[PDB]
Design a protein around this nucleic acid. Structure first.
Lengths: 134, 100, 46
RNA sequence: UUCUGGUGUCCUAGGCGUAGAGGAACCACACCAAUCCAUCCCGAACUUGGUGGUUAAACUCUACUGCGGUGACGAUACUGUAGGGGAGGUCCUGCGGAAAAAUAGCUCGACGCCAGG
RNA sequence: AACCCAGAGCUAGCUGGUUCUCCCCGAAAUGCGUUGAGGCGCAGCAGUUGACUGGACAUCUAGGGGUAAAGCACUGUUUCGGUGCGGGCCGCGAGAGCGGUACCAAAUCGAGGCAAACUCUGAAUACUAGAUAUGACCUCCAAAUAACAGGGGUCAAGGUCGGCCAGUGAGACGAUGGGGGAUAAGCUUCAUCGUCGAGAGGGAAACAGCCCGGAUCACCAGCUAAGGCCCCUAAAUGACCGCUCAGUGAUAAAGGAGGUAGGGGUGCAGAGACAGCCAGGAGGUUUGCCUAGAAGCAGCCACCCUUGAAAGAGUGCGUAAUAGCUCACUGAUCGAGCGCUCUUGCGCCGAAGAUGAACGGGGCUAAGCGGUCUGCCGAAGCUGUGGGAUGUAAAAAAACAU
RNA sequence: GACCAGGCCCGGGCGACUGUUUACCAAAAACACAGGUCUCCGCAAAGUCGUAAGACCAUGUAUGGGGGCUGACGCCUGCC
RNA sequence: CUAUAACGGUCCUAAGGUAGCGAAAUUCCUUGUCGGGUAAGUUCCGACCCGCACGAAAGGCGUAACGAUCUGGGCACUGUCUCGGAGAGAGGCUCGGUGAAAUAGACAUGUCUGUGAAGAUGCGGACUACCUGCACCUGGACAGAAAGACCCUAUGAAGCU
RNA sequence: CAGGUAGACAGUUUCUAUGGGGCGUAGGCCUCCCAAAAGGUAACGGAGGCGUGCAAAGGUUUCCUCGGGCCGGACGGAGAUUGGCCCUCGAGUGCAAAGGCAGAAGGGAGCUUGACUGCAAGACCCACCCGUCGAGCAGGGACGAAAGUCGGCCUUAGUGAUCCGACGGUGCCGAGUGGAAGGGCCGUCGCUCAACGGAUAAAAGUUACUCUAGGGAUAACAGGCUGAUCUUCCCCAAGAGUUCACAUCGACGGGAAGGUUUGGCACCUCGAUGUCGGCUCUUCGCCACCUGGGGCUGUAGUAUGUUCCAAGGGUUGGGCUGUUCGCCCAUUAAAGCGGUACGUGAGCUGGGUUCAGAACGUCGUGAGACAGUUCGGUCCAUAUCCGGUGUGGGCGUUAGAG
């Protein structure tokens, strides 16, 4: 959602790169949501997907939110554009590159996790798929 | 309303790299603190800069886990010279000042 | 919306003729066998 | 001519730990007293002068990869040039260079001087 | 704050303008400073005259780094599990020993992630230097002809320090590396490079910056680069494999799809595999709670066994509830392929603007899109044949570079 | 009977009013005004123009002469 | 009972606005809310006072008469209008005389669409147009004027404080 | 002659980067990042400090290791002072950060004044000015027994050129000569000259009464790029709808198109592209208000709700306001939204880029001012060409005609 302490208030951007070879594996959970598409995912889509698959499981099992934002995005107001004064308490952002696991789920059967992970992939600006723990 | 634009312009760095001919009094390293400790045939400065004492090459070698040791060696090397373009340059200076 | 139209010299890096067929880049000019040199263009006759 | 022990220098830095050994000689602790000296108090430290026993502590030697340090090859990311795709974020080719991490290993240092017996 | 005359041809860091020719060379839009920002002084980069010089371009080697990548060893930050310093309340009445606890939290371990102001690491390039290496041409030459090498001659090119003497100091786009923005702008600011500026020609329909390419001049000469070969408009209605049926062929996505051409997996069949018709789909049973009824069909809890060829406390409809229609499953007739997932290639929809085909045009199922094979067209490039000028150079001729 | 020759009423704002004002885009709510108040001035006055002589004031003498503000008239004009 | 403040304390000043007025030539929110007028009224009038930011000679509140003053409403009246129509003159049109002007690089001077210094008769593709007058209309020629009064720059000028 | 003293009067100043402004902010020095692994490098990019302080916190000799957790000790507890182990550089360095520094550059003790004079080979930085380091020599010393070390501080910030003036001192000049007045030279002092390369020792505002030289380098109106904002549509479905995601809405989110609002850039135009509303008169788009056809409906019929095709045609009269928009009345099949530079002022008229006069509130000491209000306030024009509507004349239509 949002980090409590910030070492630095405002932080500039950074560009996406190739396939994340570290966060591609499955640590916990049986099923996952691997992203094929490098972009930003705010904490707002993470709340949307989290409510989506928690209320789409709704009887048993547990999900695993992998990513945390850890960088802010400063939106300048409509004040005729010259400075980056204050935009730090505005929306946070997680960098996602291809390969990276976004969500995981366990305790759920086959097609209930297919609709749980697949319906909650519609709350997201980047194309994904669901991955079994091989 | 910005609280910025406080640049500094100050410069430092390695002045004379390794395997290079030094001079007596030539400033080898300008550094902040001691990235390069004074070895032999060198001297440390008032603001920890490393100058050479004698002529010759400079070298770098460890004496701990990280340290670097700027040193100076006397360099009695290389008497032979197979250069032949330069003699053609001076010889053509002679031929052009004798032709006209 | 949020899709920028490609203006001038960005239109030229996109819509220039590019021969993106790996065969037609390999083509060198044709080689005929060498011929003996042609004679003199003219000759003094006295 | 090995050990012993003052001395260094290159060092992949060679250490922790578990084990075995050494008091002929050497090194080191221990007991007694304080005159130079000394601790913001103590001869704990330092100094002087002796009983002089031990390896107990400390040093030295030999093993182990249990930690530690070091660390591959192949790959692969990246990147220089020459290009291509995408609406963008950005990706893919030819040639050259080439990681890091991890892993297989390597490492319980190596060369010299001088005085004994 | 009148008008005329005079200072006065005031002053203007501002605007406009500044007139004949030929040849050689040829920028810059950067930094610093400025009562300065559209000015100026200096440096950078020109021209010319020198004096010292011997370098440039390729290849190799050596040095410092801390960028990209990477990583959690420091600084933070963060997801989860366990032991969890410590608290929460029931409680003990009065000078408290230490009791009750599936609940929250410092610390560590494990599995993990992230960071321009984090680094145990660490490239490729770049910078400084060292080192290796004749750049073309003509001619002689070993009894000599080839060739190797050599002798001689000619040309071309780098830099430093000056003298005199200018402009320039508004840049623009394209690739990469980033910051500001909303990783929006033909946006703004930087760092390396290419072009324009100051660059003509060809391709791009037209069109500064994109690709080829560097225009001394002539020819009613030839060969090519980029790009093209149906017609407008030069050259192939060329050849052989596949694909597209949307005129896609100019276009934008999420997502949907028995589109079509494949490719990889997995499951059933000559002891009959798929699709349709027909037969069965029952007993305890209306499992136990509720309701008037809940009989599978408003719902709650599990969600049986038996006959068997198979039947599910039911897949849906329906009824006041039943009854009942029907299906998952099995039996029977003909019979030989049928599923269900990933995946590309080209396609479809998504995809809608205001004057009128508007996407070069006509049009084409190839004249479209991918993979090769041979030729041609195609510039002011190159070559060839001839002039001119500049530099060597100091007379002419000749040569090489321009 | 042609030409000629008042349209009016009901409310409100401002200015009391008749007048004056930007010749050539503003006639007004602007200026002035009668009235009020403060303040200066004893004549060789104050004030104004002029280096000066001097002049207006004024051949007038505080019931008069300047200057500031407000604007008839009616009620008043508070505190510091 | 909901309120609201007769009343109270405190801080700071030199003093904390008196009478009267009050969404006003003053009120941003605001077309405040109510009542009148109107079929319907951001304008008008009468009120409340939450006076952004009235107020007592930079006077405040009133009023008869007055005003080419502003503004609200009503009667009569009519081409203002619905929705135009006819007629008379001076022009305009034609002929004869006299006869300019602003403007003007040369003009063999189409439409769409696209491109381009981002609004093209002039460049590209297509379509459409025999040449050339006369009478009307003015959409374009970024039409004419006139070195933008607004904006900014000038180490400009000037007035005023 | 001297003091005081009125913008009554005179000459002047009143910065710049910027958002091209009231309302702000900054101007000079240092550290990290941006900064793309040499150095450099910009933005009103992200974070901080500095305008000093120390008689030791300088010099030298010598000694020592901190910091944190645990355990012990009726004051004293979690934590003071003391003892012991563990981790070994995480502490500290006058203060911001960076790089350093573990038998230290960190802490203590002794003696101390090199926090000297005269210098200085060579380097770095380099527009210039500057600024930084320095072996080595002489004098005279400090510490140490000596070796050696010391020309301030672990380093980088803690500052300011010049002209002039002042103090201390001197074997210098002394306008005929001897002096003196005065001036040098040396050592230092005096600027928040902080707009910090400093204009002068000394300087604020307004102009709507304005004026000139310029600029599209630079705003407004309009066009262009962008699409944050707005309009429209679509993907998923937790729900609401007696049951029931998808008759109808659809939360949390996501993907597009358009260029009609407000914005961003400043690319054409200021030697002139005339904004807002109304009248007249077009034409065009569909994101459909009605008319025509249809699907679905929680559609019994009437009337619907939503949606598909379809832009041929229509889309009223009025009270308020300058009004666009909007409210209200009477209705109507319905009283659509927009493009065409307000679509349209070389066709026409009011509020306005609120022009010159005046008044109210408020601000200002004042001149004056308000994206506050009110009253009054000149708007030109004979069509050259294209374009249009009408109407001819010539020629052509292959002999000439009706």
């Amino acid at each position: 959602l949002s980090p409590k302490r910030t070492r630095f208030r405002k932080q500039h951007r950074g560009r996406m790169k190739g396939i994340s070879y570290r966060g591609n594996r499955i640590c916990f959970g049986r099923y996952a949501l691997q992203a094929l598409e490098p972009a930003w995912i705010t904490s707002r889509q993470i709340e949307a997907g989290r409510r989506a698959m928690t209320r789409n499981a709704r009887r048993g099992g547990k999900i695993w939110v992998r990513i945390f934002p850890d960088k802010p995005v400063t939106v300048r107001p409509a004040e005729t554009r010259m400075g980056s004064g204050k935009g730090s308490p505005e929306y946070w952002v997680a960098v996602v590159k291809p390969g990276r696991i976004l969500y995981e789920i366990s305790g759920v059967a086959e097609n209930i996790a297919r609709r749980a992970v697949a319906i909650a992939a519609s709350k997201m600006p980047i194309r994904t798929q669901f991955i079994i723990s091989g | 309303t910005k609280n910025g634009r406080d640049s500094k312009g100050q410069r430092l760095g390695v002045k004379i790299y390794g395997d290079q001919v030094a001079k007596p009094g030539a400033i080898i390293i300008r550094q902040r603190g001691t990235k390069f400790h004074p070895g032999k045939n060198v001297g440390i400065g008032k603001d920890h800069t490393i100058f050479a004492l004698i002529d010759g090459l400079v070298k770098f070698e460890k004496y701990g886990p990280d340290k670097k040791k700027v040193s100076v060696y006397p360099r009695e090397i290389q008497p032979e010279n197979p250069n032949s373009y330069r003699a053609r340059k001076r010889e053509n200076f002679r031929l052009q000042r004798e032709k006209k | 919306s949020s899709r920028p139209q490609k203006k001038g010299t960005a239109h030229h890096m996109k819509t220039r003729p590019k021969k993106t067929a790996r065969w037609d880049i390999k083509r060198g000019p044709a080689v005929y066998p060498p011929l003996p040199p042609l004679p003199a263009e003219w000759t003094i006759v006295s």
